[PDB]
Amino acid sequence: AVGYQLLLRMLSDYSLEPTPQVLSNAQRSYDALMTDTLVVPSMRRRGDFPVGQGNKYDVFTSDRYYPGDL
Amino acid sequence: HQFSSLRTPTGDISGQNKNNLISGKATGRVGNYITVAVEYQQLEEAIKLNQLE
Fold first, then answer.
1. Chain A residue with minimal CA distance to B53?
2. Which residues, 6 or more positions from B34, have their beta carbon under 8 angstroms from its beta carbon?
């Protein structure tokens, strides 16, 4: 991926137009690289959202509402 | 107060010094502050610790 990106950014020095196969290889490698380091954030409760009676917020927890902000 | 006494065959107290009256004092003062303080991020504090108890 690094090599293909460098080649794409450097070919202009020698005034050479890249061929479609090199472009396809570069974009495929870049897609793999971005796939490797992908993280999907997870949303959290608002903070004033109630916590139901089923959670036993008397003795099991003190939370009447979610903190949900951090 | 405390006092002393003179012993004489006849009670001539003519030249002997009589008990003098001196008053004392006992002062009380104030000390320093007993201070304990904390700082924190309130959302992290309220993660599982409510009412700040």
1. A62
2. none
Structural determination approach: cryo-EM
Got the DSSP string for B3-48? Answer: ------SS---SSSPPPP---------------------HHHHTTT
Chain centre to alpha carbon of residue A38: 4
The residue count for chain A: 70
Whether residue B18 contacts residue B8, with contact meaning beta carbons closer than 8 Å, is answered with no
C-alpha of A67 from chain center:
24
Q: What is the resolution of this structure in A?
A: 3.7
Please tell me the distance from the alpha carbon of residue A1 to that of residue A48, in angstroms, as a whole number.
46
* Contact between B47 and A70 using a beta-carbon 8 Å cutoff: yes
